[PDB]
């Protein structure tokens, strides 16, 4: 991509590297795309991780992880635009009109983005990081992709961040969602978190939930790593839940 074909609007706000900038990508065909584009800071040491993770990304095609349109090699990285914006901030001012279909749709969306990832990890699935494309579809997040409240018992007491691990998380992304974005252990501060574990003790079942779902939640908060459900297997629970909550639904 040459630079002369993207053009910054305005700020959307300070990534993990540098300025992240909203802008618009015209194509070699014409065709005007919103962009945000990522920049990396002069005063950088990293330069090569940031890199890294965009040829990352560069390589990565799922409909629910967010879209890399190019990389101009001052270095910045093209990724379409979401103008609904972050996922917490979309079910928050939503709760009103939302319904317990979309969410576990979002959901069986973000299972699937980790699913196919699995086929990579991710270290920040969670509603603050997935962005919203439009009503009935959300992608996650290119930050923390890579090969405490949100933490497995083992990656607390441990250390170790296994896949299991990652459906630990996922649940607790699920349980975020079907919250409408509340924060995981709020009511905890972190010292607090894995004794209430140790103690068998869980996040509690959101208003919304469908028991199924927080039955599903329940298993990928196996203590026992081993004995939590596997991605695939997730994504077809999910996908019955879904299914059902449809039919109740109309
Ligand atoms: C902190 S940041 O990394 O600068 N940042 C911007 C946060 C602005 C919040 C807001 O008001 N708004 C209103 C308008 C808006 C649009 C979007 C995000 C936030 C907001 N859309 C968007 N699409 C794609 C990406 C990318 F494909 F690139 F992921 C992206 N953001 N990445 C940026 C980002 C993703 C997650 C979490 N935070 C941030």
């Known amino acids: 991509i040459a630079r002369e074909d993207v053009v910054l609007n305005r700020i959307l706000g300070e990534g993990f590297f540098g300025e992240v900038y909203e802008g618009v990508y015209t194509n070699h ?30 390589n ?8 890399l349109i190019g990389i101009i090699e001052p270095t910045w990285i093209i990724m379409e635009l979401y103008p609904y914006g972050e996922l917490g901030h979309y079910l928050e001012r939503n709760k009103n009109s939302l319904k317990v279909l979309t969410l576990v749709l979002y959901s069986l969306q973000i299972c699937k983005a980790m699913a196919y990832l699995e ?12 962005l919203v494309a439009s009503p009935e579809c959300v992608k996650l997040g ?30 607790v992304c699920m349980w975020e ?16 978190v894995i004794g209430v574990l140790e103690k068998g003790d869980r996040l509690p079942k959101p208003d919304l939930c469908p028991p199924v779902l927080y039955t599903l939640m329940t298993r990928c908060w196996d203590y026992d790593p081993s004995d939590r459900p596997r991605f695939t297997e997730l994504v077809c629970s999910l996908s019955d839940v879904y299914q059902m909550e449809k039919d109740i639904a109309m």
Do not use: Y
Not at 143 to 164: D, H, Q, V, Y
């Open 119 to 130: 086929s990579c990890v991710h270290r920040d699935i969670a509603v603050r990081n997935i």
């Open 177 to 192: 969602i079907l919250s409408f974005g509340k924060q995981p252990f709020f009511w905890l501060e972190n010292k607090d």
């Open 29 to 58: 065909k014409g065709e005007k795309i919103n962009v945000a584009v990522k920049t990396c800071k002069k005063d950088c040491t990293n330069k090569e991780k940031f890199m890294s993770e965009a040829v990352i990304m560069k």
């Open 60 to 67: 990565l095609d799922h409909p629910h992880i967010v879209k």
């Open 142 to 171: 290119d930050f923390g992709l890579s090969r405490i409240k949100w933490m497995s018992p083992e990656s607390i007491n441990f250390r170790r961040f296994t896949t299991a691990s990652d459906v630990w998380m996922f649940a």
